[PDB]
C-alpha cells in the first residue's frame, strides 16, 4: 500500500515545528526517553507518542515532519532499529529502555530491548552518552556535553559545525580505545557513529538560517532537555548525513574493536566501511538480524520479511536486496 512505509513529505519547506499543536511537556511517570536526542525531542513535543513507545510509521512521519529528515534515511534507521530492538508482531518500538508496553515478547534469543539495547543500534563513542561498558548508555552526560562545548569553542568559533564534528568524533573514538576494553567500532555502528555527528549541524540548526552552525543553547536544549528552541523552524529541505565524508576524513579510521583490553584496537578486515555500504546492509540482515531471529516461527518469519522489505526501501546506495529468510 502507498504510505506504508510513509513516503516523502508532500511539502518539505521550512516551517515552524515548535508550534501550538506540539508543545514541549515534562515527562510523566513511566515516559521513556533514550539515547537519540532527535526521537526524544519528537516525543517530548508530541510528534511521537509522549510515553516513548511508537510504531515504525509514527517514527518515520515524526522525523520527516519535525526535522525534515530525508525519507530513505528515515526508513532505513527506523526499520533497522525496529528489526533489532522492536516487537515485530505488535509493531511497537521503545525509544529507550525495554518495556512490557511493547507487548508479549518473542522467544529467545530475541531481546526486544528498545533503543537502549547495546550493540544492536546503540553503540560506543557517542558524543553526549557514555559507552554501555561504563553502565549508562542512554542518559545525557554533562561532562561529555561540556567537551562538545569546548570543541565548539576551539574549532567552531563557539558553534558546533562539521569541523567541530570531525575533531570531536575522533576524540571520542580515542577515549573509548583508551578506556573501554569492549570497545566495538565496526559495521553498522561505524556508519551511525559518523553520520550522527553531522545531524546537529544539518537538523538542529533553525531552517530559516540553515548555515550548519549550531549554537550551544540549542545544542543543550536538544541533547539534555529534548526541547526545541523557541520558535524553531525545521530545515528547508529533506536531509540527514550531509557532509559525513568531511567528518570521516578529518581523522581517517579503519573499523575495528578492542579485544578485551584497553589500547588493543584491532582492525576488522571483514567489516564494512563507507566504501562498502551494500556490505553493511547485507551483514546487518544476514548476521545481526539472524542472530536475534535464527529460526523464526511462520508468523515471525512473515513479520521479519515484511520489515526487511521496508528496510531495503531505505537503502540509498546502489545495492541488491538479500533474503535471509527466503521469499
Ligand X SMILES: *[C@@H]1O[C@H](CO)[C@@H](O)[C@H](O)[C@H]1NC(C)=O
- Applying CB under 6 A, what is the total number of residues that bind ligand HEM? 26
The binder of ligand HEM chosen from 17, 32, 39, 280 (CB under 6 A)? 39
The binder of ligand HEM chosen from 17, 32, 83, 115 (CB under 6 A)? 115
Give Dmax (Cα) for the chain. Answer: 57
36 annotated binding-site participant: yes
Residues near Mg ion (CB under 5 A)? 122, 126, 129
Chain Cα centroid distance, residue 183: 18
> x/- site string to ligand HEM, residues 60 to 89, per CB under 6 A?
---x---x-x----x--xx--x--------
Q: Enumerate residues 263-292 that contact ligand X by CB under 6 A.
A: 279, 282-283, 286
Cβ atoms of 46 and 23 within 8 Å: the answer is yes
Cell triple for 115? 533503543
Query: Which region, judged by CB under 6 A, interacts with ligand HEM, from 100-108, 126-134, 156-164, 292-300?
Result: 126-134
The interface partner of residue 69, options being Mg ion, Cl ion, ligand HEM, none and the CB cut-off 5 to 8 Å by kind, is ligand HEM
Q: Tell me which DSSP letter residue 141 carries.
A: -
Q: Within 10 A of 91 (CB to CB), how many other CB atoms are there? A: 18
Q: Name the residue nearer to ligand HEM (CB basis): 203 or 308.
A: 203
Give 20-65 as a DSSP string: TTS---PPPTT----S-HHHHHHHHTTSS-TTSEE-HHHHHHHHHH
The interface partner of residue 126, options being ligand X, Cl ion, Mg ion, none and the CB cut-off 5 to 8 Å by kind, is Mg ion
Tell me the β-bridge partners of 93.
54
Q: Name the residue nearer to ligand X (CB basis): 112 or 165.
A: 165
Place of cell 508532500: 10
Give 185-212 as a DSSP string: E-HHHHHHHHHHHHHHHHHSS-TTT-SS
Query: Which region, judged by CB under 6 A, interacts with ligand X, from 9-17, 19-27, 28-36, 251-259?
Result: 9-17
* Residue 204, C-beta contacts closer than 8 angstroms, at least 6 positions apart: 214, 218, 219, 222
> x/- site string to ligand X, residues 195 to 234, per CB under 6 A?
-----------------x----------------------
List C-alpha distances in Å: 233 to 8, 11, 299, 320: 18, 14, 43, 37
The site for Cl ion (CB under 5 A) is made up of 8, 70-71, 238
Binding residues, as ranges, are 36
Contact set with ligand HEM (CB under 6 A): 35-39, 59, 63, 67, 69, 74, 77-78, 81, 115, 121-123, 126-129, 192, 196, 199-200, 203
Which residues are known binding-site members for heme?
36
Amino acid at each position: 500500500e502507498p504510505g506504508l512505509p510513509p513516503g516523502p513529505l508532500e511539502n518539505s519547506s521550512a516551517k515552524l515545528v515548535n508550534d501550538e499543536a506540539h508543545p514541549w511537556k515534562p515527562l510523566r511517570p513511566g515516559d521513556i526517553r533514550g539515547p537519540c536526542p532527535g526521537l526524544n525531542t519528537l516525543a517530548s513535543h508530541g510528534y511521537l507518542p509522549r510515553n516513548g513507545v511508537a510504531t515504525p510509521a509514527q517514527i518515520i512521519n515524526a522525523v520527516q515532519e519535525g526535522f525534515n529528515f530525508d525519507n530513505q534515511a528515515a526508513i532505513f534507521a527506523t526499520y533497522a532499529a525496529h528489526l533489532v530492538d522492536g516487537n515485530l508482531i505488535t509493531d511497537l518500538l521503545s525509544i529507550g529502555r525495554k518495556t512490557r508496553l511493547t507487548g508479549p515478547d518473542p522467544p529467545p534469543p530475541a531481546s526486544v530491548g528498545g533503543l537502549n539495547e547495546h550493540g544492536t543500534f546503540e553503540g560506543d563513542a557517542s558524543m553526549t552518552r557514555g559507552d554501555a561498558f561504563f553502565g549508562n548508555n542512554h542518559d545525557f552526560n554533562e561532562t561529555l556535553f561540556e567537551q562538545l562545548v569546548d570543541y565548539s569553542n576551539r574549532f567552531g568559533g563557539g558553534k558546533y559545525n562539521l569541523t567541530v564534528a570531525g575533531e570531536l568524533r575522533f576524540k571520542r573514538i580515542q577515549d573509548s580505545i583508551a578506556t573501554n576494553p569492549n570497545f566495538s567500532f565496526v559495521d553498522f555502528r561505524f556508519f551511525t557513529a559518523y553520520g550522527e555527528t553531522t545531524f546537529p549541524a544539518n537538523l538542529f540548526v533553525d531552517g530559516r538560517r540553515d548555515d550548519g552552525q549550531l549554537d550551544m543553547d540549542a545544542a543543550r536544549s536538544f541533547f539534555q532537555f529534548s526541547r526545541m528552541p523557541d520558535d524553531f523552524f525545521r530545515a528547508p529541505s529533506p536531509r540527514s548525513g550531509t557532509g559525513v565524508e568531511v567528518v570521516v576524513q578529518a581523522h581517517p579510521m579503519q573499523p575495528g574493536r578492542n579485544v578485551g583490553k584497553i589500547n588493543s584496537y584491532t582492525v576488522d578486515p571483514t567489516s564494512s566501511d563507507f566504501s562498502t555500504p551494500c556490505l553493511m546492509y547485507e551483514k546487518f540482515v544476514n548476521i545481526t538480524v539472524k542472530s536475534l531471529y535464527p529460526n523464526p516461527t511462520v508468523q515471525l518469519r512473515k513479520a521479519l520479511n515484511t520489515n526487511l522489505d521496508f528496510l531495503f526501501q531505505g537503502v540509498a546506495a546502489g545495492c541488491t536486496q538479500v533474503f535471509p529468510y527466503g521469499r
